[PDB]
């Protein structure tokens with residue numbers, strides 16, 4: 001229910017969604 | 023014909039290492055890119 | 061001998077519980093513990 005090449009990027013979190021679900 | 027344009031490999035690289043008096047071994051991580059052209 | 065290695069981070073030691081509707085775990089011994097919190 002819920003919804004780049006100019007030097008700005010996004011970093012992935014250390015704790016993935018699977019670890020949070022666990 | 024249609025051709026998609028994509029910026030090739032670019033992404034903030036980083037380097038991880040322990041303390042100096044522990045060892046001199048070092049590691050390098052190329053982030054958000056596949057280092058196949060390296 | 062020692063080298064840099066990589067691995068998936070652990071989410072804690074897995075510990076199952078023997079849950080039942082006719083048993084319960086009760087502490088028979090105890091202890092004191094002093095912890096620090098620096099703010």
Ligand SMILES: *[C@@H]1O[C@H](CO)[C@@H](O)[C@H](O)[C@H]1NC(C)=O
Nearest residue numbers: 040041042043044045046062
């Ligand atoms: C590096 O120095 C610190 C501070 O004296 C010490 O605690 C640590 O054990 C040293 N590292 C090694 C590998 O001996």
Ligand SMILES: *[C@@H]1O[C@H](CO)[C@@H](O)[C@H](O)[C@H]1NC(C)=O
Nearest residue numbers: 031054055056057058059060
């Ligand atoms: C990244 O490159 C490796 C080869 O170094 C390849 O095996 C892998 O499939 C590539 N991954 C993606 C997502 O392209």
Ligand SMILES: *[C@@H]1O[C@H](CO)[C@@H](O)[C@H](O)[C@H]1NC(C)=O
Nearest residue numbers: 078079080081082083084085
């Ligand atoms: C606990 O639940 C089981 C499952 O319905 C039941 O058979 C049993 O009588 C209950 N009580 C116990 C094990 O003391």
Ligand SMILES: *[C@@H]1O[C@H](CO)[C@@H](O)[C@H](O)[C@H]1NC(C)=O
Nearest residue numbers: 086087088089090091092093
């Ligand atoms: C509980 O643990 C302590 C730990 O020092 C021990 O001395 C004691 O004998 C144990 N049992 C009881 C009933 O206190």
